[model samples]
Target: MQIFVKTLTGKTITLEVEPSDTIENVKAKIQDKEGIPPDQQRLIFAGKQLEDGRTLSDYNIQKESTLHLVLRLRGG
Candidate 1:
């Protein structure tokens, strides 16, 4: 399934993932794909939190779901 991802720097990326992956796995993938850390990750699907360790299937994220990874910004 494809998902929409956003970085703290305002960059957006979209990619496809397998249906059998957990949200944590997705987080890692996002980090790999977008250069963001898992701790800095916040997976939001259709405007809701898909917190770490949760499965996409558990959150009703079926095939073709457009998930969003909202990366929170921080710095001095």
Candidate 2:
């Protein structure tokens, strides 16, 4: 299914994904479209931070849901 990923700056992008795809996998896809690094981008939904190793099936992310994009505070 496709979902919206919006940045803090109000930039939003549409992307395709599946429950089988891990958070890490999605980040790579986001990077391809947004030019942000996978390790630097973290996703959150309804104030819940999604883990990189975990898949969305467990998080219950439904179709057309929007995930907020946040940058990690740590230095690379």
Candidate 3:
């Protein structure tokens, strides 16, 4: 299976994923590919934020499902 991810920078890529993989697992892959930290990554699917504890299958993610990736801003 695979998932499509679109970054805020307008880069879109596909990742090989499994239904048993958690959202956090996906974030790790994204971090490696996009250079965004796992903690700073904000993943959105189906207009909702994806939780780390949930598996992609739990959210009904299908092959070629598009997930939006954004960096979580921080300031003091």
Taking all chains together, the TM-score of candidate 1 against the true structure is: 0.73
Candidate 3 achieves a global lDDT of 0.90
Clashing pairs in 3: none
Q: What are the TM-scores, per candidate, against the unseen true structure?
A: 0.73, 0.91, 0.91
Ranking by TM-score: 3, 2, 1
Find the number of clashing residue pairs for candidate 2. Answer: 0
Output the lDDT of residue 41, model 1.
Answer: 78
Query: For model 3, what is the error of residue 31's alpha carbon versus the real structure, in angstroms, after optimal superposition?
Result: 1.2
Best by lDDT: 3
How would you encode candidate 1's per-residue C-alpha lDDT over 1-76 as one tens digit per residue?
8766665456778767776788888888888877778887788887788877778778888766666666666761
Provide the lowest-lDDT 10-residue window in model 2.
67-76
> Local error of candidate 2 at 7, Å?
0.6
lDDT per residue for candidate 2 within 1-26, as digits (tens), equals: 99889999889999899978899988
Residue-by-residue lDDT tens digits, candidate 3, 1-76:
9899998688998899998899999999988887877899889998999999999999999898999988887861
Task: List runs of model 1 lying over 4 Å from the truth.
Answer: 6-12, 73-76
